[PDB]
Write a structure and sequence with these properties.
homodimer, 363 residues, alpha/beta, 11 helices, binds N-carbamoyl-L-aspartate, binds zinc ion, Multifunctional protein CAD (chains A, B), hydrolase, DE novo pyrimidine biosynthesis
Chain lengths: 363, 363
């Protein structure tokens, strides 16, 4: 007996096109998404060229329209030069991405004043998300308050961060957050097995206490999102390993395992991979779209999943229970038992749908 | 013709006793203060042992009472273990010091949650000051708002920081700040002359643009304070140079030079070295206390000033106009033209004066 789920949404993926297509491209990354029960993705802007201006966004839109197999929205990225220049294209993006710490990214800002400038100039009704670790979470929350708007915190990974956000929510501040599966299912205990190259990720893997704190504070977590960050094994194992884990194909099975163990409910999962992503980012429904999962199937994660060009996974050897059997996207069978059945280009930019524009007051 | 000033107050000095007395002690540091026209100092807690508990404070109080030549108050320092334990001695201190970044200091905290705990437990009516650079200023401002109280930011050094504080004040937030003379009178341009060891200080010396921004935003600066941070020349020039500059003997002459050039007024100076320190820290008046300065005397800063045991200065070679001629402290001549005339032990703990307790609602 299969369980029918709505089309799940991952608001944080790196699909590497343009410019890093040996790591992943729209076609392979969205195949990975479908195999993971995800029918809509929001792609980050730290590509080459990075998506920090209108011409780069135009290019990325066309590449995505030609290559994506599931539906998508594309983030714009904040830079040290583009505040006040994105107004005409802002509404066509998933939101604005701020990179506020060192990581795989034309996009660290030099000064909190540049963060302020972005918060002041980006349209007030559109989403802003931030890579903001440790004290940076408090700092960007301060900027959001000074500019009297909301902010969404990407991949919360630490007890420190989730408790800060918890305190902010208790004060009624407009902040939401997401957590990635590696920060729920891996910790320092796994670094011996992974090694120092494979183990590189930002935010870094946390202690057992960090992991336990995220679970204990599940009520504070608005979304799950993979931070799918594919790099090849050669890159991960080489002399300057880039941070990041692939995760689209493993996220839902890991979380289904947790549901089966009573660690969270099916509803808790659906709030975090469907309803809250929709409402935070004003993402439209997908008609005739659903995912069928088998909650009984026990399997062990192999050394690589079938679709991501990363061709490795940090979850190798973990025992999971739950698998994606079928995905239907807008009335077409998109995935069945290991086979993707929609071609590159089937996917659409949801921000171009009438129902996918973010509502705003007449300007 | 001399000008009579009130007794000036430096709310940020490191006097190194206990435990670093080759660098400075209460007797030498307060001689330096008097020679710089300063009659009251607030001493930081990063000594050895650090002033992070009641027994250490008791020791420091006695050492200061026996050695100080001018009046003083002693800060307590926040640690990872003492939140919620300082209530009985809190009112006897200048305030609570938080070290939130890497610098010469049992006292970096590991987590913003520890900052929160201090803001929640330290009595709400008593001062909190923070070493908080760049984004850390925004982060600690966020903690202050979450806990609905004020904060004072130490040694603001950057355009980024002063503009953030300016924006916070425009939103009516209870934040004050101080600036040290080296961030007004030295910059990157001086690093060649100083060299990499002598030039080490935290916050680091800023660009010309940082310096210009602090001057342009003088209205945002509540206090001047030296961050007198003496280390010996051997230490500054050695293989692991500690950050910090001595500054008590040079601060007032540098600022008087600026007054003479019309860069700020005598009133602007007195707000920042007398009236605002008094009101932010609830420091009492000193009866029969004044400083006489000669605004006409031109001189060049030598390779070391007479009193600080640091026996070096980063301001060597700068031409100044203005000198301290006489200091009277509580009816006794304390300093005349290079001679200190009050003994170690003349100085008193102002928090023990009836008028020096911080007022509070009956608890
Ligand atoms: N998480 C990572 O370690 N790397 C991400 C960047 C990011 O999400 O910060 C990537 O794009 O590779
Ligand atoms: N400013 C410095 O460079 N060092 C100070 C510490 C401090 O004020 O942060 C010191 O105590 O030496
Ligand atoms: Zn990130
Ligand atoms: Zn994110
Ligand atoms: Zn990312
Ligand atoms: Zn400091
Ligand atoms: Zn200070
Ligand atoms: Zn200091």
């Amino acid at each position: 007996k299969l369980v029918r789920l709505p089309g799940l949404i991952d608001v944080h993926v790196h699909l590497r096109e343009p410019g890093g297509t040996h790591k992943e491209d729209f076609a392979s990354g969205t195949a990975a998404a479908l195999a993971g029960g995800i029918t809509m993705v929001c792609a980050m802007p730290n590509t080459r060229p990075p998506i920090i201006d209108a011409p780069a966004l135009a290019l990325a839109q066309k590449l995505a329209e030609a290559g994506a197999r599931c539906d998508f929205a594309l983030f714009l990225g904040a830079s040290s030069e583009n505040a006040g220049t994105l107004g005409t294209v802002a509404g066509s993006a998933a939101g604005l991405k701020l990179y506020l710490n060192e990581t795989f990214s034309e996009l660290r800002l030099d000064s909190v004043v540049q963060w302020m400038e972005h918060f002041e100039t980006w349209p007030s009704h559109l989403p802003i998300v931030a890579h903001a670790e440790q004290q940076t979470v408090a700092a960007v929350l301060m900027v959001a308050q000074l500019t009297q708007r909301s902010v969404h915190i990407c991949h919360v990974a630490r007890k420190e961060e989730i408790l800060l956000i918890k305190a902010a929510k208790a004060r009624g501040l407009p902040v939401t957050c997401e957590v990635a599966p590696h920060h729920l299912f891996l910790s320092h205990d796994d670094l011996e097995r992974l090694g120092p190259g494979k183990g590189e990720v930002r935010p870094e893997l946390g202690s057992r206490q960090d992991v336990e704190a995220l679970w204990e504070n599940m009520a504070v977590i608005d979304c799950f999102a993979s931070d799918h960050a594919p790099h090849t094994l050669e890159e991960k194992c080489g002399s300057r390993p880039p941070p990041g884990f692939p995760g689209l194909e493993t996220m839902l099975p890991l979380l289904l395992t947790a549901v089966s163990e009573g660690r969270l409910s099916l509803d808790d999962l659906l709030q975090r991979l469907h309803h809250n992503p929709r409402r935070i980012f004003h993402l439209p429904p997908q008609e005739d779209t659903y995912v069928e999962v088998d909650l009984e199937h026990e399997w062990t994660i192999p050394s690589h999943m079938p679709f991501s060009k990363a061709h490795w996974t940090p979850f190798e050897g973990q025992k999971v229970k739950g698998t994606v059997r079928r995905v239907v996207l807008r009335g077409e069978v998109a995935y069945i038992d290991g086979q993707v059945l929609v071609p590159p280009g089937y996917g659409q930019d949801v921000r171009k749908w009438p129902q996918g524009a973010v509502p705003q007051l007449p300007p």
